[PDB]
Design an enzyme around this catalytic site. Structure first.
Site, PDB file in Angstrom:
ATOM      1  N   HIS A  68       8.528 -45.477   6.056  1.00 26.73           N
ATOM      2  CA  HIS A  68       6.930 -45.071   5.499  1.00 26.73           C
ATOM      3  C   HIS A  68       6.156 -44.870   6.626  1.00 26.73           C
ATOM      4  O   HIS A  68       5.343 -45.575   6.905  1.00 26.73           O
ATOM      5  CB  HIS A  68       6.751 -46.045   4.553  1.00 26.73           C
ATOM      6  N   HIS A  72       7.262 -39.146   7.381  1.00 30.21           N
ATOM      7  CA  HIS A  72       7.394 -39.152   6.052  1.00 30.21           C
ATOM      8  C   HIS A  72       6.112 -38.586   5.256  1.00 30.21           C
ATOM      9  O   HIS A  72       6.425 -37.575   4.347  1.00 30.21           O
ATOM     10  CB  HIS A  72       7.406 -40.779   5.505  1.00 30.21           C
ATOM     11  N   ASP A 107       0.995 -42.965   1.819  1.00 28.06           N
ATOM     12  CA  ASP A 107       1.760 -44.208   2.206  1.00 28.06           C
ATOM     13  C   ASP A 107       0.935 -44.839   3.388  1.00 28.06           C
ATOM     14  O   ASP A 107       1.562 -45.542   4.333  1.00 28.06           O
ATOM     15  CB  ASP A 107       3.165 -44.149   2.881  1.00 28.06           C
ATOM     16  N   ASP A 217       7.687 -37.062  -3.014  1.00 21.57           N
ATOM     17  CA  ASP A 217       7.990 -38.547  -2.159  1.00 21.57           C
ATOM     18  C   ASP A 217       9.543 -38.633  -1.870  1.00 21.57           C
ATOM     19  O   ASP A 217       9.649 -39.021  -0.958  1.00 21.57           O
ATOM     20  CB  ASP A 217       7.706 -39.731  -3.173  1.00 21.57           C
TER      21      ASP A 217
END
Ligand SMILES: Cn1cc(CNc2cc(OC[C@H]3C[C@@H]3c3ccccn3)nc3ccnn23)cn1
Ligand SMILES: [Mg+2]
Ligand SMILES: [Zn+2]
Length: 321
Positions: A68, A72, A107, A217
């Site tokens: 994360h 990402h 995130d 995601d």
């Protein structure tokens, strides 16, 4: 430096594809986000100076965790870019602006811990946010960056517009809580099969945006097999580090967070594709038919994991460890 960047010509056609891997272009990631914004809502949708300050501060607020992280954020934003490009008129200018920003920020300041970890071990974030703990924190972090001097990319909007974007963003980030996905997808499936799904209906619209967020995601399952496999290594490195933390505290983690249970990864991935990824992209394709290449690529990777379990296929592709 970001303001000065120019995108290589070869990428013009490549960045448009759903299976595009940003992986080999680390130095170009902030510039790639700028190009995507410019193609999605035009060169005069955000002030370049503000946008570049925003992007660079977002990058800084992503930790050096195995999964994360900054890579990402950009991967998720690129999948959203491709979704929006292939269904451009379905979304408003405000939605395009909000969703690309929400993906880049979804995130922010992730610590490499699940919401169950934070809730179980009484972390201060869990005391402040009872449900969707990390996702409520990610949204808060996004607001704080926007509130910084020279970072408010949404300053030129009317308040009914600004409050509207901040709400599109809030709902989009919360929707990345995988615990919320199952009920959302079940709802959308029902609306589609009964023919009641109406994109003019705001409740229905928020649900579709929610599914889009999940689809972005998890998009590593929609890349070419060597990329998917390499990202799976990063996903499990993060799960295993959390498991390691539980073990130090005398608690046995579930097999997905246990590095001593690596042999269960192929079966674990088969389960995840069957219960999570395949239904996600199946529902998304039904609602937004141009998103079909994501479902097609997901099915190909499901077949690859099936081959791994059968002993037909084998981490990193290298002659040495
Ligand atoms: C790090 N992180 C990632 C996420 C969500 N994204 C994510 C999670 C995931 O979980 C797979 C484990 C459940 C499987 C399991 C069960 C038992 C034994 C072994 N594996 N697999 C994949 C593939 C692509 N994305 N993705 C949330 N935190
Ligand atoms: Mg998240
Ligand atoms: Zn994410």
């Amino acid at each position: 430096g970001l303001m000065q960047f120019t995108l290589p010509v070869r990428l013009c056609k490549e960045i448009e594809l759903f299976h595009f891997d940003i992986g080999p272009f680390e130095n170009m990631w902030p510039g790639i986000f700028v190009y995507m914004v410019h193609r999605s809502c035009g060169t005069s949708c955000f002030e370049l100076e503000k946008l570049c300050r925003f992007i660079m501060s977002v990058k800084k607020n992503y930790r050096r965790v195995p999964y994360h992280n900054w890579k990402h954020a950009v991967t998720v934003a690129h999948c959203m870019y491709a979704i929006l490009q292939n269904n451009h008129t379905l979304f408003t200018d405000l939605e395009r602006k909000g969703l690309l920003i929400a993906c880049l920020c979804h995130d922010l300041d992730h610590r490499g811990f699940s919401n169950s970890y934070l809730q179980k071990f009484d972390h201060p974030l869990a005391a402040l946010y009872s449900t969707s703990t990390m996702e409520q924190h990610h949204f808060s972090q996004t607001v704080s960056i926007l509130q910084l001097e020279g970072h408010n990319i949404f300053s030129t909007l009317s308040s009914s517009e600004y409050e509207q974007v901040l709400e599109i963003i809030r709902k989009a980030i919360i929707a990345t809580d995988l615990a919320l996905y199952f009920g959302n997808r079940k709802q959308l499936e029902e609306m589609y099969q009964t023919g009641s799904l109406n994109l003019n209906n705001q409740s229905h619209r928020d649900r579709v945006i929610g599914l889009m967020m999940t689809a972005c995601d998890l998009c590593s399952v929609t890349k070419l097999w060597p990329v998917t496999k390499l990202t799976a290594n990063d996903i499990y490195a993060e799960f295993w580090a959390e498991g390691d933390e539980m073990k130090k505290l005398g608690i046995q983690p579930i097999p997905m967070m246990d590095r001593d249970k690596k042999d269960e990864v192929p079966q674990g991935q088969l389960g995840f594709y069957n219960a999570v990824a395949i239904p996600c992209y199946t529902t998304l394709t039904q609602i937004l038919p141009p998103t079909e290449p994501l479902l097609k690529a997901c099915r190909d990777n499901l077949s690859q994991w099936e081959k791994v379990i059968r002993g037909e296929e084998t981490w990193i592709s290298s002659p040495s460890v």
